[PDB]
Curated annotation (Swiss-Prot), chain A:
The protein's name in its UniProt record: Nuclear cap-binding protein subunit 1
Pfam family name, one: MIF4G_like
Family in the record: Belongs to the NCBP1 family.
Family annotation (Gene3D superfamilies): 1.25.40.180
Chief subcellular location: nucleus
SMART domains in the cross-refs: MIF4G
Record keywords: Acetylation, Coiled coil, Cytoplasm, Isopeptide bond, mRNA capping, mRNA processing, mRNA splicing, mRNA transport, Nonsense-mediated mRNA decay, Nucleus, Phosphoprotein, RNA-mediated gene silencing, Translation regulation, Transport, Ubl conjugation
From Swiss-Prot, chain B:
Function per UniProt: Component of the cap-binding complex (CBC), which binds co-transcriptionally to the 5' cap of pre-mRNAs and is involved in various processes such as pre-mRNA splicing, translation regulation, nonsense-mediated mRNA decay, RNA-mediated gene silencing (RNAi) by microRNAs (miRNAs) and mRNA export. The CBC complex is involved in mRNA export from the nucleus via its interaction with ALYREF/THOC4/ALY, leading to the recruitment of the mRNA export machinery to the 5' end of mRNA and to mRNA export in a 5' to 3' direction through the nuclear pore.
Organism: Homo sapiens (Human)
Protein name: Nuclear cap-binding protein subunit 2
Effect of substituting residue 21 to A: Does not affect mRNA cap-binding
Compartment(s) of residence: Nucleus; Cytoplasm
Complex and partners: Component of the nuclear cap-binding complex (CBC), a heterodimer composed of NCBP1/CBP80 and NCBP2/CBP20 that interacts with m7GpppG-capped RNA. Found in a U snRNA export complex with PHAX/RNUXA, NCBP1/CBP80, NCBP2/CBP20, RAN, XPO1 and m7G-capped RNA. Interacts with PHAX/RNUXA, EIF4G1, HNRNPF, HNRNPH1 and ALYREF/THOC4/ALY. Interacts with SRRT/ARS2 and KPNA3.
Positions with biased composition (Basic and acidic residues): 130-140
Modified residues (Phosphoserine): 9, 14
Family the UniProt entry places it in: Belongs to the RRM NCBP2 family.
One biological process term in Gene Ontology: mRNA cis splicing, via spliceosome
Omega-N-methylarginine PTM positions: 142
Length: 704, 146
């Protein structure tokens, strides 16, 4: 309690200097060692594992305690090694890295002997020598080594440069033979201009190469221990026992490979501090620490924004740019962001509040840049951009200089930019209303605005007496008004001809039940629940469910949000099933709205519900099989028709279709992994056009 | 685990407590701490169920939304209830939707013990919400004066 607060608070807001507080804490801990050594050892191992953003602050504290008490220092180190093995054993490689870095920096604090770390790293790199083991296993150990260098590279080289060169040789040889099949599936942009979206290991290697070329000198990391050279130098070091990486097992789970998000360079902030380059270790450390800060404080938006803004460094940096960049890097991360998407929206708002005179401008600028680079942006990321921007706009009076994006008006309506604007406007309307959005946009954008979400009745004041089951529905309209029961509506649907499954009976029942409830969502939900017995009966068939969806769509095709909520309700009440909805989405009826966001939101919402169904493994697996089949079929038809008619393959329609397939894998990779054999044998075989097959091979590379 | 990292102030219970709640305080809190239902305040009178659906779905799937109505005029009086399927989703609405805008108004969310018949009406003497009985200002989105 008390001791935990002291250790966790060191380095924060204080009238005294950091070194002062550090030495002040070392004293307090030393005094409590006789009665609370166990608690102190645990707490220190804990901040080493959970507070990586404060790595040098705590390594220094350990160094000072080690100087005063060599025994305690040896126990701490022993405890760290034990926690590391347990972390690896539990597949917590992500936390394992912070421990490896903590042990590395401890060398600088004269707590651990340089030779010990060099010896351990050799065993790390030897992992790349293991045969028949996942590349993601080999990658992690390489990453653990390299990402430690920014902190201990200098020391390690100045003591065992000979040993370090052998390690670098093996490391480089390994990096040269790695597969990059995953890259295309994880890049936020395909274009390599203005910034290539690089594979994380190739990037880090380049940053370390630059560091090595600079005699292992970087200008960012804060090292409080340099102020205690007197004490630490006269402190005895400890040796690390030989380290043996836990062997690979069928139960081993390693981190997926990553691709570095990049959108800024020093030229984006001319009148500010020089932004560290994409290939500098400073850029790596800065971003890694800011990601860590968000990871620690994601539940407290105000505290998270304050910690990001108060981020410290050895030299000035264009922090606002780094912060916004790191946030978009998380929001746009593939397969998924580290935290729920909505948190990033509120987090940026809190940052605008904290740096009112500078953040809002950096953000408007980034938003301008994201827009202008939309042509090669992956569909999954575009969806998040659309959802963020619109939500953001709704928190600031929907104010925006749309005329700055007029360049979209003269483009193909299917092109990224104009489509983006249309989806944003559509999203803004859902948070407001038609006329509202129609006024916030320039006259030259009235076309890109969403149509008015008005109901559609085939048997309304426009219909004709010459319509199938016309009068039968007109009689139902009165039946619903007079408040009838299921049995009553049943007998009323008897007077319907059959052009079991009766298409007309279902049409008149829906076209009428929906129209007389076109008021609100609760009006529709209360209608479905009321005549639920009737629905089940009329939609017992699969063709019945598929028709209920087809009619409901022809009634609310101008109100995409109503379609979503209606589909979700029918599924939850067993009016229809996930399979019928999946088929409905690929039906020719929605072929024209197939590229619109609401379609994919409905699909993904449907899959999510299925993923929650208990004891439905078979049904869940079948849902995915069906989706993949439909995709393979429509994609193949397009690809063949382009080869037979010698037409363009990469059309806006294709970009979406192929990326929506990719999105299924990204969004549900863990589940889909269980279907590997079935997929390689029955669906994604060597017979598929390489365009389609590549998406499956990319998916497999995520854990290969 | 570290106390500092466990901090979750946005999910903590507020000081509000249904006085009409047929039960003890210890019991009301017992329900609040496991609720998936949130009370949403300071809504505009022209704020629709559809708009509330669009906003609150950003933290998860919504089971049901009950608009607050004037016990007499039976019209939207400025508040509602939002029920989620899981506790985790309600919590993320408390952490990230609470204190943000809906119709250019800063809304407030609070844990609720659970919906019951009648709780959707304004307990205000005039029919609407109690708070509106005392406000002095002119709120265009709340009918005007108090
Ligand atoms: C804020 N709410 C409300 N609710 C739930 O909403 C339903 C409708 O109830 P409502 O009309 O909002 O009224 P309450 O029952 O919620 O009562 P309130 O706390 O307003 O009572 C305040 C008491 O204080 C007295 N008072 C003196 N002076 C003032 C003043 O200047 N302002 C105010 N506001 N009160 C003043 C009053 O005379 C009164 O005795 C209903 O279902 C209700 O439960 C809700 N639910 C949750 N979970 N959380 C909330 O924050 C709220």
């Amino acid at each position: 309690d008390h001791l935990e607060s002291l250790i966790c608070k060191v380095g924060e807001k204080s009238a005294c200097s950091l070194e002062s507080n550090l030495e002040g804490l070392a004293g307090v801990l030393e005094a409590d060692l006789p009665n609370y050594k166990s608690k102190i050892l645990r707490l220190l191992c804990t901040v080493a594992r959970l507070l990586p953003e404060k790595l040098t602050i705590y390594t220094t504290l350990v160094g000072l305690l080690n100087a005063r008490n060599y025994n305690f220092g040896g126990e701490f180190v022993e405890a760290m090694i034990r926690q590391l093995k347990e972390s690896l054993k539990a597949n917590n490689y992500n936390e394992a890295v912070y421990l490896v870095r903590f042990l590395s920096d401890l060398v600088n604090c004269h707590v651990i002997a340089a030779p010990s770390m060099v010896a351990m790293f050799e065993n790390f790199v030897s992992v790349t020598q293991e045969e028949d083991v996942p590349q993601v296993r080999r990658d992690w150990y390489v990453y653990a080594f390299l990402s430690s260098l920014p902190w201990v590279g200098k020391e390690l080289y100045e003591k065992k440069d000979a040993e370090m060169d052998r390690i670098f040789a093996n490391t480089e040889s390994y990096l040269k033979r790695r597969q990059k099949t995953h890259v295309p599936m994880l890049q936020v942009w395909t274009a390599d201009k203005p910034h290539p979206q690089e594979e994380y290991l190739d990037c880090l290697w380049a940053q370390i190469q630059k560091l090595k070329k600079d005699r292992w000198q970087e200008r960012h990391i804060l090292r409080p221990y340099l102020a205690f050279d007197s004490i630490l130098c006269e402190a005895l070091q400890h040796n690390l026992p030989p380290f043996t990486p836990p062997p690979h097992t069928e139960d081993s789970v390693y981190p997926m490979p990553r691709v570095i998000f990049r959108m800024f360079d020093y030229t984006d902030d001319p009148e500010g501090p020089v932004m560290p380059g994409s290939h500098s270790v400073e850029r790596f450390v800065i971003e890694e620490n800011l990601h860590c800060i968000i990871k620690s404080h994601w539940k407290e938006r105000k505290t998270c924004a304050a910690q990001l803004v108060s981020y410290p460094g050895k030299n000035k940096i264009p922090l606002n740019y780094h912060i916004v960049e790191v946030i978009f890097a998380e929001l746009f991360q593939l397969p998924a962001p580290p935290h729920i998407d909505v948190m990033y929206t509120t987090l940026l708002i809190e940052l605008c509040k904290l740096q009112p005179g500078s953040l809002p401008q950096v953000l408007a600028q980034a938003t301008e840049m994201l827009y202008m680079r939309l042509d090669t942006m992956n569909t999954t990321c575009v969806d998040r951009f659309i959802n963020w921007f619109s939500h953001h706009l709704s928190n600031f009076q929907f104010r925006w200089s749309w005329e700055d994006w007029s360049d979209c008006l003269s483009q193909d309506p299917e092109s990224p930019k104009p489509k983006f604007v249309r989806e944003v406007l559509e999203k803004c309307m859902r948070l407001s209303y038609h006329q509202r959005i129609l006024d916030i946009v320039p006259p030259t954008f009235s076309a890109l605005c969403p149509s008015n979400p008005t109901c559609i009745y085939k048997y309304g004041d426009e219909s004709s007496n010459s319509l199938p089951g016309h009068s039968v529905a007109l009689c139902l309209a009165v039946a619903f008004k007079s408040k009838a029961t299921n049995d009553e509506i049943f007998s009323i649907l008897k007077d319907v001809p059959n052009p079991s499954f009766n298409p007309l009976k279902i049409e008149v029942f829906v076209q009428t039940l929906l129209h007389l409830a076109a008021k609100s969502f609760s009006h529709s939900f209360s209608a479905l629940a009321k005549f639920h017995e009737v629905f089940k009966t009329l939609a017992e068939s699969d063709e019945g469910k598929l028709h209920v969806l087809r009619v409901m769509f022809e009634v609310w095709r101008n109100h995409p949000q109503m379609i979503a909520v209606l589909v979700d309700k029918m599924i939850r009440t067993q009016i229809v099933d996930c399979a019928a909805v999946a088929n409905w989405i690929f039906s020719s009826e929605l072929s024209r709205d197939f590229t619109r966001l609401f379609v994919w939101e409905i699909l993904h919402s449907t899959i999510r519900k299925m993923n929650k169904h208990v004891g439905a493994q078979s049904e869940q697996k079948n849902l995915f099989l069906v989706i993949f089949q439909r995709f393979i079929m429509i994609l193949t038809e397009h690809l063949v028709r382009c080869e037979t008619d010698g037409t363009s393959v990469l059309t806006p329609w294709y970009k979406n279709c192929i990326e929506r397939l990719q999105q299924i894998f990204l969004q549900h990779h863990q589940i889909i992994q269980q279907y590997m054999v079935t997929l390689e044998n029955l669906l994604f075989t060597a017979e598929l056009d390489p365009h389609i097959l590549a998406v499956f091979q990319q998916f497999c590379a995520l854990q290969a | 685990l570290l106390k500092a990292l466990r901090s979750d102030s946005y999910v903590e219970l507020s000081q509000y407590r249904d006085q009409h709640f047929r039960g003890d305080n210890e019991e009301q809190e017992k329900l609040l701490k496991k609720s998936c239902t949130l009370y949403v305040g300071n809504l505009s009178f022209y704020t629709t169920e559809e708009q509330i659906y669009e906003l609150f779905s950003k933290s998860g799937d919504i089971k049901k939304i009950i608009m607050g109505l004037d016990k007499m005029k039976k019209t939207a009086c400025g508040f509602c209830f939002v029920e989620y399927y899981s506790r985790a989703d309600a919590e993320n609405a408390m952490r990230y939707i609470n204190g943000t805008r809906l119709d250019d108004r800063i809304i407030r969310t609070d844990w609720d013990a659970g919906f019951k018949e009648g709780r959707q009406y304004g307990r205000g003497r005039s029919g609407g919400q109690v708070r509106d009985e005392y406000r002095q200002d002119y709120d265009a989105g709340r009918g005007g004066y108090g």
